[PDB]
């Protein structure tokens, strides 16, 4: 495709082609009612090609030029103002409403559980009428509505997850967000069920704890779609996967030190069991060694069996785990964060264009014809609509030697070709030249 | 233009609060309000006084690195809010019978204090377990190991990696930024002074004696000691020379074709 070939091969001509799409009104009247017009005729195919996979029978994607510019890493073209206004129009068309609906359903699930936790003392069995101790009134109207909201949100989450099962067709097995949602909705069901079926308070609060943990832990995954927080979520992902790869070294090293301290320091209560000794060394990992309480004061009271071996184990633990292993994790984290911030400005716009090109494949085509626009008119003097809340929302959440030497090499190759032709002409001159009075 | 400016806000807080700390010479004020204002004022005076070190040449680089790290820490705050609220409400449900986790707000403040690594394992987890005072002990220890992995290991190393990257980015351009701040200071200050003072104070030439020290050797010298102190262009020149070379070679090729066009061929034809 010639536009995609221009993006692949000569992007500095695609820049000029996009410069013809930008229009202006008057250079002197730039403050008084001034406008600029953006035309998006070269950035996408017509809509009747894109969603017509059976009947047009040609491969198409929505946002053709943007996907071609992302696959070829042409970031100076993604930062062109025509492309910026194209994504901004595409977000104001259907991306904002779809994302706020997707966030609003989950937040409707999220808020009543936190209200219900911070308004009820844990450990006590509570029911639609109140809290069983006698019954506690004066909050039952709030408690009943919050339990109904959590119950309805959990069953609609089941229906949405079953729809994603019967649509995704077994690609959803190795996916973390599905597993987190299964845990959230099952556990939030069990926390609320005493309005139907009586449950002991121990099981009820044991489920409430897990649910209130995983709701807010899952709610970090919805910050990845925004432009400010997605880079923190992807750096946290990279550091956490790097920490997962290194876990067997933790297991072996920690099990060595834990069983050694279990044999050495057996008479003390933190090292009574082997499992408690393992958990204690895991807590000592950061540097909370407890030298005076566990090593010195038993030594001065003659309560250490094997004291020399115990202090040698202490200095060996202090050298290996809090010095060496923690600095290893710090060096790995510094390297990974530098690697991620090397490619941040491309990754942001790539996530946005992937979000829109994934969302557009599911919407119906009449809605696409209704909502899209071919041109946008921008007034720099006039602010955008919805100045009260939407402006604060957009402030808070939204925002070369190689090619030179390659051109050098092309010019030098043209130079040596011309010089070869010229050398052939000079040999032809000497072949046809007339030599009189210079022979012999 | 002064609305989105931090130094104006700090000065409003400083001067209002220092007024209220002193007003018992005019109007009698209870001692509680007076010392409540004195605390805020003595905090913000010395906290504001860092902003005046930015004009000097030695300390301005530390003030701008501290600015960069602090803005980077401000951008990441919603991750702190969500993660800390998750762990705080989880510990509030789990460890409810203990005094640091009696309220949800106290539980949130306690997890914020546990952030750095002051976990209090023996006092809050072990010794209640040995006295059978933990409800849900397995879930409690699982929450403990999950908290130890997420917040002091992962999140703190993330902040360290971001700080290392930002400080490297700032020290990449330090020597230009120092002189740029000095020349911006002088070119901003000169627009407000009157013109007769400018004609009075400026000089066209300066004479420097390397053998003779500058005037005010006692205090001003110690003050000036304490507070004051390429491949791309080469390949571009390469490209210009090569372009001139190919232009000359084209002219020469045209001359050689003209030679063959006008040449006289006798006894070499056919
Ligand atoms: C003695 C003991 C020693 C042990 C040492 C062990 C050391 C080992 C340590 C850690 C290994 C375990 C880490 C688990 C998840 C890592 C993978 C992951 O999320 O990356 C990716 C996202 O990453 C993110 O950005 C998400 C980050 C937040 C998720 C938090 C949930 C975890 C809660 C669990 C707590 C359970 C505790 C319960 C207790 C009650 C997801 O993977 P992906 O498919 O690439 O991306 C798809 C993303 N979309 C498209 C779906 C959006
Ligand atoms: C559970 C809780 C969890 C919460 C997590 C929260 C995590 C979030 C953390 C932090 C976010 C808040 C940071 C506030 C300021 C950051 C912006 C800033 O100063 O940068 C710039 C300078 O930067 C500097 O170099 C100045 C540095 C010193 C200023 C210190 C004053 C702060 C005192 C507040 C303490 C209040 C406490 C009161 C209590 C009594 C100023 O901005 P600028 O316009 O670019 O430059 C103009 C500079 N000139 C020209 C004016 C000179
Ligand atoms: C997010 C938006 C939700 C905000 C609505 C919360 C109002 C509930 C509230 O204040 O109840 C009061 C308690 O407030 C809370 O602590 C609710 C905490 C939920 C915060 C989650 C966000 C009850 O006090 P009283 O009966 O007036 O005496
Ligand atoms: C307790 C532990 C529960 C945590 C399990 C969740 C881990 C899932 C991450 C995973 O498998 O990612 C894969 C990484 O695999 C690993 O190295 C995980 C190692 C864990 C082994 C511990 C036994 C591939 O990453 P990606 O899909 O490119 O992103
Ligand atoms: C390197 C990986 C090897 C780690 C596996 C060690 C687990 C052995 C273990 O704890 O065995 C028994 C199992 O204890 C438990 O409750 C679960 C143990 C799982 C620990 C695995 C964590 C390693 C990382 C402990 O028995 P006891 O407390 O001495 O009382 C017995 C009364 N009849
Ligand atoms: C890579 C090198 C690893 C070396 C492995 C050996 C263990 C590491 C120990 C280092 C300690 C450094 C200096 C300590 C010198 C103290 C001398 C002394 O009199 O203490 C004595 C030192 O105790 C010991 O550590 C002796 C070890 C006995 C184990 C016997 C068999 C192990 C030898 C391995 C043979 C392999 C040789 C291959 C080469 C006993 O004092 P106590 O423990 O206070 O008992 C009194 C009970 N109330
Ligand atoms: C390696 C360099 C080792 C340097 C010095 C080790 C000298 C210790 C051996 C004998 C000390 C006897 C003893 O009970 O020491 C007591 C305990 O001190 C110790 O045993 C310290 C042992 C430190 C061993 C360090 C070697 C481990 C190095 C591994 C690093 C691998 C990474 C206290 O001494 P005191 O208060 O003077 O008591 C006098 C009353 N009799
Ligand atoms: C308690 C909190 C009070 C702290 C408020 C002071 C923050 C002002 C910094 C600011 O707005 O800078 C702007 C940065 O905006 C942010 O990301 C601040 C995020 C804080 C959100 C918390 C709610 C632009 O920086 P600059 O003007 O280029 O230098
Ligand atoms: C993620 C962001 C959500 C954070 C909002 C949670 C605040 C809920 C809260 O503390 O509600 C009530 C408000 O408590 C306060 O004094 C201020 C709470 C503000 C906390 C916000 C900090 C989050 C970061 C606590 O009620 P109580 O102590 O149980 O006693 C009630 C007696 N009638
Ligand atoms: C990403 C993976 C997250 C998994 C989420 C589940 C919670 C994480 C827990 C991990 C623990 C690892 C090994 C522990 C095994 C111990 C077995 C055992 O006998 O303990 C038992 C373990 O307790 C539990 O944690 C059971 C949890 C009950 C909640 C029931 C409903 C939640 C299940 C979710 C279903 C979703 C499935 C989707 C796939 C009870 O002992 P206790 O708490 O000491 O109570 C005695 C009171 N005096
Ligand atoms: C993941 C690998 C998990 C490894 C081992 C878990 C084995 C614990 C289950 C059953 C232990 C029963 C128990 O009460 O343990 C007691 C408490 O220990 C625990 O429950 C430790 C639980 C650790 C769970 C770790 C899994 C969380 C991983 C999430 C990381 C995500 C990042 C003490 O044991 P004991 O002194 O041997 O008592 C014996 C007298 N009956
Ligand atoms: C191939 S013909 N390029 C795609 C395209 C995009 C916009 C307008 C025309 C063509």
Swiss-Prot record, chain B:
The modification Cysteine sulfenic acid (-SOH) is found at residue 59. Residues 27-32, 96-104, 126-136 are extracellular. The chain crosses the membrane at residues 2-26, 33-53, 66-95, 137-163. A 1,2-diacyl-sn-glycero-3-phospho-(1D-myo-inositol) binds at residues 237-243. Changing residue 8 to S: Lacks calcium-mediated potentiation and lacks desensitization. The record marks 118 as: Crucial for calcium permeation. Residues 233-262 form a coiled coil. Residues 105-125 dip into the membrane without crossing it. TRPA1 activation by electrophiles occurs though covalent modification of specific cysteine residues in the N-terminal cytoplasmic domain. Hydroxylation is required for TRPA1 activity inhibition in normoxia. In hypoxia, the decrease in oxygen concentration diminishes the activity of the hydroxylase EGLN1, thus relieving TRPA1 from inhibition and ultimately leading to channel activation. Residues 54-65, 164-270 are cytoplasmic. It is found in: Cell membrane. Ca(2+) binds at residues 8, 11. It is linked to Episodic pain syndrome, familial, 1: An autosomal dominant neurologic disorder characterized by onset in infancy of episodic debilitating upper body pain triggered by fasting, cold, and physical stress. The period of intense pain is accompanied by breathing difficulties, tachycardia, sweating, generalized pallor, peribuccal cyanosis, and stiffness of the abdominal wall. Affected individuals do not manifest altered pain sensitivity outside the episodes. Ligand-activated Ca(2+)-permeable, nonselective cation channel involved in pain detection and possibly also in cold perception, oxygen concentration perception, cough, itch, and inner ear function. Has a relatively high Ca(2+) selectivity, with a preference for divalent over monovalent cations (Ca(2+) > Ba(2+) > Mg(2+) > NH4(+) > Li(+) > K(+)), the influx of cation into the cytoplasm leads to membrane depolarization. Has a central role in the pain response to endogenous inflammatory mediators, such as bradykinin and to a diverse array of irritants. C-terminal helices from the four subunits associate to form atypical coiled coil structure; this region is probably involved in binding the inositol polyphosphates that are required for optimal channel activity (in vitro). Homotetramer. Interacts with TMEM100. Interacts with EGLN1. Interacts with the scorpion wasabi receptor toxin at the same site that electrophiles but in a non-covalent manner. This is Transient receptor potential cation channel subfamily A member 1. It comes from Homo sapiens. The chain holds residues 798 to 1079 of 1119 of the full protein.
């Amino acid at each position: 495709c010639p536009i995609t070939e221009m993006i692949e091969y000569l992007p500095e001509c695609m820049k000029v082609l996009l410069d013809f799409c930008m229009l202006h009104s008057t250079e002197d009247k730039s403050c008084r009612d001034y406008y600029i017009e953006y035309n998006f005729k070269y950035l996408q195919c017509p809509l009747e090609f894109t969603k017509k996979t059976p009947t047009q029978d040609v491969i198409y994607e929505p946002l053709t030029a943007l996907n071609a510019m992302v696959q070829n890493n042409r970031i100076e073209l993604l930062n062109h103002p025509v492309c910026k206004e194209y994504l901004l129009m595409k977000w104001l068309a259907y991306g904002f409403r779809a994302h706020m609906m997707n966030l609003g359903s989950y937040c409707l699930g999220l808020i009543p559980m936190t209200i219900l936790v911070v308004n009820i003392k844990p450990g006590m069995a509570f029911n639609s009428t109140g809290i069983i101790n006698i019954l506690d009134t004066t909050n039952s109207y709030l408690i009943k509505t919050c339990m109904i909201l959590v119950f309805l949100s959990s069953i609609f989450g089941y229906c949405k997850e079953a729809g994603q099962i019967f649509q995704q067709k077994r690609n959803y097995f190795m996916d973390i967000s599905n597993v987190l949602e299964w845990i959230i909705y099952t556990t939030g069901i069990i926390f609320v069920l005493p309005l139907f079926v009586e449950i002991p308070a121990h099981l009820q609060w044991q489920c409430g704890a897990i649910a209130v943990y995983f709701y807010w832990m899952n709610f970090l995954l919805y910050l990845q779609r925004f432009e400010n927080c997605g880079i923190f979520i992807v750096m946290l992902e990279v550091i956490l996967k790097t920490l997962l790869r290194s876990t067997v070294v933790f297991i072996f090293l920690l099990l060595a030190f834990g069983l050694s301290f279990y044999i050495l320091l057996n008479l003390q209560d933190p090292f009574s069991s082997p499992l408690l000794s393992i958990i204690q060394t895991f807590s000592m990992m950061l540097g909370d060694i407890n030298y005076r309480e566990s090593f010195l004061e038993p030594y001065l009271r003659n309560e250490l069996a094997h004291p020399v071996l115990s202090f040698a184990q202490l200095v060996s633990f202090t050298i290996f785990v809090p010095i060496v292993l923690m600095n290893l994790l710090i060096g790995l984290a510094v390297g990974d964060i530098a690697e991620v911030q090397k490619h941040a400005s491309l990754k942001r716009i790539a996530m946005q264009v992937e979000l829109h090109t994934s969302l557009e494949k599911k919407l119906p085509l009449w809605f696409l014809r209704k909502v899209d626009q071919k041109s946008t008119i921008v007034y720099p003097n006039k602010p955008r609509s919805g100045g009260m809340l939407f402006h604060i929302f957009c402030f808070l959440f939204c925002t070369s030697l190689e090619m030179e030497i390659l051109k050098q090499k092309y010019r030098l190759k043209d130079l040596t070709f011309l010089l070869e032709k010229q050398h052939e002409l000079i040999k032809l001159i000497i072949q046809k030249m007339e030599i009189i009075s210079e022979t012999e």
